[PDB]
Amino acid sequence: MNPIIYTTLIMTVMSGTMLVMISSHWLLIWIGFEMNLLAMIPVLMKNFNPRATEAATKYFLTQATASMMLMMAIIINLLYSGQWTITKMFNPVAMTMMTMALAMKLGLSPFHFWVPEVTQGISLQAGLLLLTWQKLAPLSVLCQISQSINPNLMLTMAMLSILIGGWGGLNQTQLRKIMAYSSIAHMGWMTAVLPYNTTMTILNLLIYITMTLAMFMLLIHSSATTTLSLSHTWNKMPVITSLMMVTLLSMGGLPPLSGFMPKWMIIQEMTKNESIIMPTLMAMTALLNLYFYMRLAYSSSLTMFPSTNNMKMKWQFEHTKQMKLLPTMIVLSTLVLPMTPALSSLN
Amino acid sequence: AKTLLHKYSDIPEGTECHRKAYASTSIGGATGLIVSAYSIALKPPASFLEGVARTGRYTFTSAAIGAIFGLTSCISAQVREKPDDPLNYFIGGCAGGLTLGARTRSYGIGAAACAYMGLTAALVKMGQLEGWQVFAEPKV
Amino acid sequence: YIAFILSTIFVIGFVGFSSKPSPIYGGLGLIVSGGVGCGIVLNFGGSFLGLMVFLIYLGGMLVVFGYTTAMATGDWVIYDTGDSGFFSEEAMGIAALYSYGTWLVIVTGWSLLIGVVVIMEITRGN
Amino acid sequence: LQYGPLAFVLGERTTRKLTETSKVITVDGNICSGKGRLAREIAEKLGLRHFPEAGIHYADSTTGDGKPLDVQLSGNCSLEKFYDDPKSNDGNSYRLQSWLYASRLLQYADALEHLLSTGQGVVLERSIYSDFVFLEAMYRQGFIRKQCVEHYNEVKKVTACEYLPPHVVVYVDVPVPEIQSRIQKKGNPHEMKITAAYLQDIENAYKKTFLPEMSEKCEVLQYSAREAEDAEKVVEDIEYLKCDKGPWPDQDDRTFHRLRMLVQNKLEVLNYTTIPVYLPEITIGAHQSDRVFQKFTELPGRKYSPGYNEDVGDKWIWLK
Amino acid sequence: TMMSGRPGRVPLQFLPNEARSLPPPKLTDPRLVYMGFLGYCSGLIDNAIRRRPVVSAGLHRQLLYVTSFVFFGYYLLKRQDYMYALRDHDMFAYVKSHPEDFPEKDKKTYGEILEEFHPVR
Amino acid sequence: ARQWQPDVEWAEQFGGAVMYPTKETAHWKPPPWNDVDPPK
Amino acid sequence: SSLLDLIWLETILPKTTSFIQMKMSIMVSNQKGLIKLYFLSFLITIMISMTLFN
Amino acid sequence: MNIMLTLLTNVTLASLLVLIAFWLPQLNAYSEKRLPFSMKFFLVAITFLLFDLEIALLLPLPWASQTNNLKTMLTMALFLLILLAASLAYEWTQKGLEW
Amino acid sequence: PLVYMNIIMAFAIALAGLLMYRSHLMSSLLCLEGMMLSLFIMSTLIILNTHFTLANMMPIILLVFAACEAALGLSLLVMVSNTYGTDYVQNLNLLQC
Amino acid sequence: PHGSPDWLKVGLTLGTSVFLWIYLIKQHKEDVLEYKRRNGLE
Ligand SMILES: CCCCCCCCCCCCCCCCCC(=O)OC[C@H](COP(=O)([O-])OCC(O)COP(=O)([O-])OC[C@@H](COC(=O)CCCCCCCCCCCCCCCCC)OC(=O)CCCCCCCCCCCCCCCCC)OC(=O)CCCCCCCCCCCCCCCCC
Ligand SMILES: CCCCCCCCCCCCCCCCC[C@@H](O)O[C@H](CO[C@H](O)CCCCCCCCCCCCCCC)COP(=O)(O)OCC[N+](C)(C)C
Ligand SMILES: CCCCCCCCCCCCCCCCC[C@@H](O)O[C@H](CO[C@H](O)CCCCCCCCCCCCCCC)COP(=O)(O)OCC[N+](C)(C)C
Ligand SMILES: Nc1ncnc2c1ncn2[C@@H]1O[C@H](COP(=O)(O)OP(=O)(O)O)[C@@H](O)[C@H]1O
């Protein structure tokens, strides 16, 4: 599309998210979600092909259903109390409806099915936006109403998300589906700590966003969308593959990397509330994410796969466009564990 | 809901074998029905009749597992004269695993099922005794 | 129980079109349901909002739906007691949109302009 | 300021650059035909920019210094070995074919970039579109396998679906016996080994498959050896015809912006030429890959970006 | 803890006025040095990705990297110290105002405490 | 006397639509390289 | 060496874990991509959450 | 109830007249012997829908003029009309109103 | 009371019909529109019963936004048809989990 | 390609670094003085 129109649409997406984040009226939050959904569809469909169109319609149907149930929950809450302010939910049925709507907006299990297909259908830039920016508004709304969530439903959906992400990532050779399942598992980790501490949720979201931005930018730099295509990168730019390997090790929660900070903290917080079994199962299940990260690292940088002759021509050329903040994203996603006590800034 | 859980738990551990068996059978049947609904939704095999056959098979398997577990655990607790002991649940769990292995007609699942189920039932009994919480309330 | 009778019909029409037979017939069922719902709102006392249903919903959105398809193949107790004066409160609250709801007008107008742009960009094709 | 979204937003519109003479032109013919002289004369008369036919070391002439690199660092193939032993054990024939297609793709991208950046037209020899005739002949003579032509078809699909075909196709027709006499006169000992069958299949592919498909979306001027001697009538024919059937009149400023962002950034042009399809003729083992890549790095001016090589005489590296 | 609803809190203030009563972090703070090290690593990685001599490609760029990291780290350290000070202040005030929830334990001596002994055999 | 490195046979196990192929999945095909489906 | 170390100790911990995780991965990821079944499942989970957690 | 009776009478008379029209000539004995999907028409329908939404927004103007906040109301009404004109201009300039 | 229950029941029926997905994505869009109409009726009744004057704008707003969404959905549907010749739901199986 | 050291960008980067350093040092001094004044140290 025209660059002016693209910039306007991106600004509209961000403005819808910010309208959700700054408003105290339920109708304005709904309007922010509507504006975000309206501006999001062209961004997914920017490169026109049947796959992108299919992904856009799937995303539209899912988000429209979620927004309809969100409006229903708002109306029920207003019926049982003449309130429009986003606070305590005042009704269990309305709160269950709101939780389910926000879960489908986020892609938590069992509403996870659309995330892998939408991510596979769209390009890498649209996938970056969808997996990083499109999580802020529902998580902020969940943080604002955390004191009213039924912990049983929230914890059930979080544990299901962790399990589903871990199991679904094992079967994937497409990198975008791997990212989608990783996102589902990280969303489960984020939402398993909402009932106890929203600061932990925000810290996990920040760390995950940094890591996802770094990995998506590394995938864009080495324009690969499959495992075998990524296995050719060492013969053109081995530095990119080494950086990606360290980032993948960080994403697996291995200390002393940055990705260890959230789980650690979350586990600690859960233990402070006499919750022992669930964090144990959560770490056991995150082992699966680590396994398929390690498989990608094996195929990418720790071994050398066969190349092709036409790669020689590619040796004579350099990337014309360089993404700023990529080095900062890599450093922030690998080496911020010693600065862990900074979380008291209520990030 | 928790109604079935209340019906099962309100019975004392070493008494009313028939009531405990019936409650465990009901819980197993409910679990099998839920699994059948999910399987039918995600995988429509060929037709309505095959779907109802699959639903009935899953429900009967789950109900039989629950019934065997409940009967065996209650009988073990009664005859051993040592209630509040996880070995009775372990024995019940192993029996349930064996019942499932016999239903599927394969020794590896039965052997594997018996060991894992026995462990899970003993763990649940230990959690009841010690007060372990799976879904903890936000204390702090 | 006139309101109750309308409500029962409303649900029956919803069951009719929710079975999703022959989308033209589902559209006819949704048209009947929308008419009954507008009747409910009118019988309640919301004349402007019921007429807004009847005009906007039925005559624009369901008309566009049918056009696109054609291209292809207990009561009376909870009520008030006093009167509203020499105006209608619903009209006053709706007209307060330009004096109280400046923020609402701004965000809605921006959304509608963005919607026009988005529709054009999506239907461009290429 | 390099071209990008910001340049497009502020001032850069390529539609005002077109001046009815852009008219990308491609000239095709059999081996050792007179098409090169005709294309050079067309470029000289019309004021366009001539592109000599892309060879094995075309990419070397555009990067670093224009001097070609070693054969094992650039191309890993030779035409003389194909002429001597076309039925090679090492599958050099298809390696040469794939490398030549990639070179033609790079040259087409360069020509499109020049045309869209300046408005001046360009003249080309055998482009990517006409590249297939050699592959067809090489298949009918038994030099390559069917898997090779399938791989070529996949690559050609994913690459050529993103560019505008040439406005005018100029074909020179020469008889096979006359062209064999011309090879005899050339004196190149390796060229004297081409059988008449190879030339006949080249001509058959050209006539049966390439000419009619280009006649459906472009303007075609079929010329003989005699009437290609005078370029005046050729230029008169070029000016007389008008392009109204091709996709070029359909293009607008937005599509031009997209295609101009594509023609620069050569790594995106070359992206799908190395798809992970493992055919023994082109797949290279890890050890040889590592050795050859390390060897390439050793060459002066290749270790660091173009402006960051002290060995080459670059200065103020710390401040750049 | 959840100090979001703490009374007298300005909605979007990075550092309140009352934060100025606390000692500022020293410029040789080890955490500040680690932030500068992070900036230096970012500069080196920027050199490596762009295919430039890693150690000595852009000195101005590396200096800007380090300086920006140090600047943001200083302000972040100030905010973190202030937040921990608030936590401790509230804890002590609450303990003072609820003496019946925090009784003084009657001190006992090990000579009058009977602890069970387990031999290792 | 040489370190082992993956070869074509080793590299082909990651070229399918998914890992761990089954009877149901056996007919699945990887997406196109440019992620474009012919208009047909 | 053979029966215990190479077979049964291998069978118990690592091989069983691999088999179970791979079977669960095949179960979870083998979905045809039809919104029919996905939204039917959504309806089922909505009913379960309505009638089980309250 | 008066409007209900009026609508009932109108519908009853229409049905009776149409039925007698369709059944009077059916008593005597006689012989008794695609793809295109134009985009432009869809675009016209969608433009109608969006402009109708903006009309729905503009409708309360006859009541909006008695508020004592005349400057704010005038500003917001002119804002709505200006954005409606901007939507028309955008559709016009990007070749959205051609045949 | 009973009137509120019927409106909710209509919303639940429309949501269930949307989640059934027999075929004909147009039926899905119709179910979404029925859900929104139910929401409009319910919110209007609540706002009128309690004499919340300033809330009288809220139904209109909702309607407008919903119709905009409807337009968007319709556009998507058309594009899908223009690729397959039909609005059949089973034709959207290129992307899979 | 063939490019000289861009003196504009180098100057801007160096000036930004110097300005940030001076601002940080001044801010630290003011913080120390204000803390001392508030707590009555010096
Ligand atoms: C508690 C921890 C304490 C230590 C902290 C550790 C981390 C600190 C540093 C973090 C990163 C910052 C620097 C790394 C940038 C990467 C650039 C690079 O590759 O190196 C090239 C460059 C030399 O090569 P070149 O000739 O310039 O150009 C070649 C091209 O760059 C490209 O050459 P090429 O393309 O021809 O070669 C390709 C090669 C190139 O591939 C690479 O080398 C990429 C580097 C790995 C990725 C970096 C990850 C990001 C940071 C995460 C760190 C993880 C730490 C957590 C612990 C887990 C350990 C893994 O890739 C491969 O061969 C593929 C095989 C992969 C092998 C296995 C991969 C393992 C990676 C894990 C590395 C972790 C430690 C790295 C230590 C530093 C490495 C330089 O290295 C350097 O010389 C710079 C290193 C640092 C400079 C120090 C100078 C300061 C001294 C001044 C005075 C002393 C200070 C004291 C003051 C008081 C005195 C008075
Ligand atoms: C990988 C680590 C994360 C990196 C994050 C990106 C880094 C670049 C961002 C640059 C700084 C952004 C701060 C914005 C400037 C002013 C902010 C101020 O106006 O807002 C305050 C808020 O300030 C921010 O919250 C502090 C952000 C600091 C983030 C650092 C914590 C990182 C965790 C520890 C890892 C170490 C990282 C160190 C290297 C960067 C007031 O918040 P308030 O409106 O009243 O309450 C709303 C928030 N609630 C609901 C959670 C309570
Ligand atoms: C502060 C930061 C400014 C720059 C950042 C802008 C961020 C994005 C733009 C959106 C901000 C909207 C600003 C207006 C907020 C509305 C409230 C304010 O304007 O007061 C109103 C005053 O109305 C003003 O006249 C509104 C004028 C603003 C509209 C003109 C331009 C709007 C463009 C905003 C961006 C939308 C897209 C851009 C189109 C070009 C209320 O009037 P008043 O009567 O006292 O109070 C009503 C209550 N009563 C009845 C009890 C008395
Ligand atoms: N696709 C190809 N396969 C094999 N050889 C090729 C190919 N393209 C060009 N050549 C070789 O390039 C050489 C010179 O090109 P040609 O047009 O035939 O003669 P000239 O340019 O001197 O008029 C010829 O020997 C021809 O065989």
Q: How many domains does chain C have?
A: 1
Q: What is the CATH number for C39? A: 1.20.120.1200
Give the number of C-alpha atoms closer than 13 A to the C-alpha of residue I12, restricted to the C-beta side. 10
Spatial distance between the Cα atoms of G22 and G27, rounded to a whole number of angstroms: 9
**CB pair distance less than 8 Å for G25 and F20:** yes
Token duo for residue A215: 């990995």
State the DSSP string of chain D.
--SSHHHHHHT--STTT--S----EEEE-STT-SHHHHHHHHHHHHT-EEEPPP-TTTGGGGSSSSS---TTTTTS--HHHHHH-SS-TT-HHHHHHHHHHHHHHHHHHHHHHHHHHH---EEESS-TTTTHHHHHHHHHTTSS-HHHHHHHHHHHHHHHTTSPPPSEEEEEE--HHHHHHHHHHH--TTGGG--HHHHHHHHHHIIIIIHHHHHTTSEEEEEETTTTS-HHHHHHHHHH----SSSTTT--HHHHHHHHHHHS-HHHHTGGGG-S---TTTEE-HHHHHHHHHHHHHSTT-SS-TT--TTTT----TB-
| Angstrom distances, CA of residue A322 to CA of A221, A257, A326, D154, H46 | 8, 26, 9, 30, 41
Which protein residues touch ligand 4 with a CB less than 6 Å away?
Answer: D 31-33, 36, 53, 79, 97, 100, 131, 134, 191
Binding residues of D for ADP: 32, 35, 83, 97, 104, 126, 131, 134, 186, 191
Spatial distance between the Cα atoms of D170 and D172, rounded to a whole number of angstroms: 7
Q: Which ligand is nearest to the CA of C112?
A: 3
Contacts of B34 in chain G (CB under 8 A): 48
Token duo for residue A203: 């810290």
From the list B78, B80, B91, the residue with the least C-alpha distance to B121 is B91
Which residues in chain A (26-45) have CB-CB distances under 8 A to chain C?
Answer: 28, 31, 34-35, 38-39, 41-42, 45
Q: What residue type is assigned to position B117 of the chain?
A: M
Helix H or strand E encompassing C35:
helix C23-44
Q: Which residue of I has its CA nearest to C69?
A: I26
Token duo for residue A95: 């709160």
From the list A178, A302, A318, A327, the residue with the least C-alpha distance to A252 is A178
Spatial distance between the Cα atoms of D95 and D316, rounded to a whole number of angstroms: 41
CA B66 to chain CA centroid, Å, is 4
Torsion of CA D65, D66, D71, D76, to 10 degrees: 100
Say if CB A225 and CB A174 are below 8 A apart: yes
Helices I2-20 + I25-49 axis angle, to 10:
160
CA dihedral sign of residues D140, D144, D147, D152: negative
**CB pair distance less than 8 Å for F8 and D278:** yes
Find the domain containing E40 and state its range: 1-98
β-bridge pairing A307-308 and D219-224: unpaired
Spatial distance between the Cα atoms of B70 and B76, rounded to a whole number of angstroms: 10
**CB pair distance less than 8 Å for I82 and H37:** yes
Helix H or strand E encompassing J28:
helix J7-39
Resolution to 1 decimal place, in Å = 2.7
User: Could you tell me if G26 lies within 8 Å of chain F, comparing CB atoms?
Assistant: yes
Spatial distance between the Cα atoms of A160 and A162, rounded to a whole number of angstroms: 5
Across-strand partners of D154? none
Percent composition of chain A: helix, strand, coil (DSSP 3-state, to 5): 75, 0, 25
Contacts of G49 in chain A (CB under 8 A): 96, 100, 153
C:H CB pairs within 8 Å? 92
Helix H or strand E encompassing A308:
strand A307-308
**CB pair distance less than 8 Å for A51 and F20:** no
Report the atom number in ligand 3 closest to the C-alpha of A15: 8
Question: Residue I97 domain-assigned?
Answer: no
**CB pair distance less than 8 Å for A195 and B139:** no
Give residues with Cβ within 8 angstroms of A53, minimum separation 6.
A45, I76, I79, I80, I83
Say if CB I48 and CB C92 are below 8 A apart: no
Residue C101 phi/psi, 5-degree rounding, is -95, 55
| Angstrom distances, CA of residue B56 to CA of B40, B62, B96, D43 | 12, 10, 19, 81
Report the atom number in ligand 1 closest to the C-alpha of A335: 52
Pocket of ligand 1 contains residue A246 by CB under 6 Å: yes
Question: Residue H45 domain-assigned?
Answer: yes
Torsion of CA G23, G28, G34, G37, to 10 degrees: 110
Token duo for residue I66: 């919903």
Spatial distance between the Cα atoms of D112 and D25, rounded to a whole number of angstroms: 11
Q: How many domains does chain E have?
A: 1
Token duo for residue A157: 């959906």
Spatial distance between the Cα atoms of D274 and A229, rounded to a whole number of angstroms: 9
Across-strand partners of D28? D171
User: Could you tell me if A68 lies within 8 Å of chain I, comparing CB atoms?
Assistant: yes
Peptide bond into A279 cis (omega under 30): no
Contacts of I97 in chain A (CB under 8 A): 113, 116-117, 168
Q: Whose CA is nearest to atom 26 of ligand 1?
A: E53
Which residues in chain E (88-107) have CB-CB distances under 8 A to chain A?
Answer: none
Say if CB D318 and CB E56 are below 8 A apart: yes
Spatial distance between the Cα atoms of A287 and D121, rounded to a whole number of angstroms: 60
Say if CB I92 and CB A54 are below 8 A apart: yes
Contacts of G29 in chain F (CB under 8 A): 18
Spatial distance between the Cα atoms of A81 and A75, rounded to a whole number of angstroms: 10
Q: How many domains does chain I have?
A: 1
Token duo for residue B60: 């009967």
Question: Residue H37 domain-assigned?
Answer: yes
| Angstrom distances, CA of residue A335 to CA of A246, C37, E35, E74, G10 | 10, 60, 10, 18, 37
Report the atom number in ligand 1 closest to the C-alpha of E54: 27
β-bridge pairing D168-173 and D219-224: parallel
Residue A67, burial from CB neighbour count under 10 angstroms (0-12, 13-18, 19+):
buried
Give D58 Cα–ligand 4 centroid separation in angstroms.
14
- For A226, the 3-state DSSP assignment is strand
Token duo for residue A226: 């499959």
A297-312 burial, b if ≥16 CB within 10 A, otherwise e? Answer: bebbbebbbbbbbbbb
Spatial distance between the Cα atoms of D267 and A315, rounded to a whole number of angstroms: 10
Spatial distance between the Cα atoms of A292 and A173, rounded to a whole number of angstroms: 10
Give A243 Cα–ligand 1 centroid separation in angstroms.
10
B80-108 burial, b if ≥16 CB within 10 A, otherwise e? Answer: eeeeebbbbbbbbbbbbbbbbbebeeeee
Spatial distance between the Cα atoms of J36 and J42, rounded to a whole number of angstroms: 6
| Angstrom distances, CA of residue E117 to CA of E111, E120, E121 | 14, 10, 12
Q: How many domains does chain H have?
A: 1
CA A188 to chain CA centroid, Å, is 10
Across-strand partners of A85? A25
Q: Choose the mutation target among D267, D297, D311, D317 for the interface with E, i.e. most E CBs under 10 Å.
A: D317
Q: Which ligand is nearest to the CA of E37?
A: 1
Token duo for residue D198: 């190879």
Domain spans of chain F, in order of start: 1-40
Helix H or strand E encompassing J8:
helix J7-39
Say if CB D247 and CB D164 are below 8 A apart: yes
β-bridge pairing D283-284 and A307-308: antiparallel
**CB pair distance less than 8 Å for G21 and A288:** yes
Q: Which residue of H has its CA nearest to I64?
A: H53
- Residue given tokens 């101005």 in the structure block: E60
Spatial distance between the Cα atoms of A211 and H60, rounded to a whole number of angstroms: 50
Give residues with Cβ within 8 angstroms of D169, minimum separation 6.
D26, D28, D211, D214, D218, D219, D220, D221
User: Could you tell me if A171 lies within 8 Å of chain F, comparing CB atoms?
Assistant: yes
Residue F32, burial from CB neighbour count under 10 angstroms (0-12, 13-18, 19+):
middle
As a whole number of Å, the CA-based R_g of chain G is: 20
Q: Choose the mutation target among C10, C14, C19, C84 for the interface with I, i.e. most I CBs under 10 Å.
A: C14
Q: Do chains B and H touch (3 or more CB pairs under 8 A)?
A: no
Helices B107-130 + B86-104 axis angle, to 10:
150
Give residues with Cβ within 8 angstroms of E117, minimum separation 6.
none
Give A306 Cα–ligand 1 centroid separation in angstroms.
25
- Pocket test residue of D30, D33, D35, D53 for ligand 4, highest count of atoms within 8 A of CB: D53
Number of H helices, E strands in chain G: 3, 0
Q: Whose CA is nearest to atom 13 of ligand 4?
A: D31
Spatial distance between the Cα atoms of D39 and D171, rounded to a whole number of angstroms: 10
Spatial distance between the Cα atoms of B5 and A333, rounded to a whole number of angstroms: 46
Find the domain containing H30 and state its range: 1-94
- For A344, the 3-state DSSP assignment is helix
Query: Looking at CA atoms only, how far is residue D296 from chain E in angstroms?
Result: 15
Query: Looking at CA atoms only, how far is residue J20 from chain D in angstroms?
Result: 20
State the DSSP string of chain I.
-HHHHHHHHHHHHHHHHHHH--S-HHHHHHHHHHHHHHHHHHHHHHHHHTT-GGGGHHHHHHHHHHHHHHHHHHHHHHHHHHHHSS--GGG--SS--
Say if CB A70 and CB A141 are below 8 A apart: no
Spatial distance between the Cα atoms of I56 and I44, rounded to a whole number of angstroms: 8
Find the domain containing I6 and state its range: 2-91
Q: Which residue of A has its CA nearest to C123?
A: A42
| Angstrom distances, CA of residue G47 to CA of A155, G44, G54, I28 | 18, 5, 12, 20
Query: Looking at CA atoms only, how far is residue H66 from chain C in angstroms?
Result: 9
| Residue G4 DSSP one-character state | I
Q: Which ligand is nearest to the CA of A240?
A: 1
Q: What is the CATH number for I64? A: 1.10.287.3510
- Residue given tokens 């390289």 in the structure block: F33
From the list A112, A146, A159, the residue with the least C-alpha distance to A284 is A159
Q: What is the CATH number for H47? A: 1.20.58.1610
Query: Looking at CA atoms only, how far is residue A180 from chain E in angstroms?
Result: 26
- For A241, the 3-state DSSP assignment is helix
User: Could you tell me if E67 lies within 8 Å of chain J, comparing CB atoms?
Assistant: yes
Spatial distance between the Cα atoms of H16 and H26, rounded to a whole number of angstroms: 15
**CB pair distance less than 8 Å for D254 and A321:** no
- Residue given tokens 């009371």 in the structure block: I1
Helix H or strand E encompassing A18:
helix A3-22
As a whole number of Å, the CA-based R_g of chain D is: 21
CA dihedral sign of residues I66, I67, I71, I77: positive
Binding residues of D for Mg(2+): 30, 32, 35, 53, 125
Question: Residue H99 domain-assigned?
Answer: no
In this complex, the chains that touch C, judged by 3 or more CB pairs closer than 8 A, are A, H, I
Q: Which residue of C has its CA nearest to I83?
A: C125
From the list B138, G50, G42, the residue with the least C-alpha distance to A92 is G50
User: Could you tell me if E20 lies within 8 Å of chain J, comparing CB atoms?
Assistant: yes
Question: Residue E112 domain-assigned?
Answer: no
Say if CB D211 and CB D202 are below 8 A apart: no
Say if CB A61 and CB I87 are below 8 A apart: no
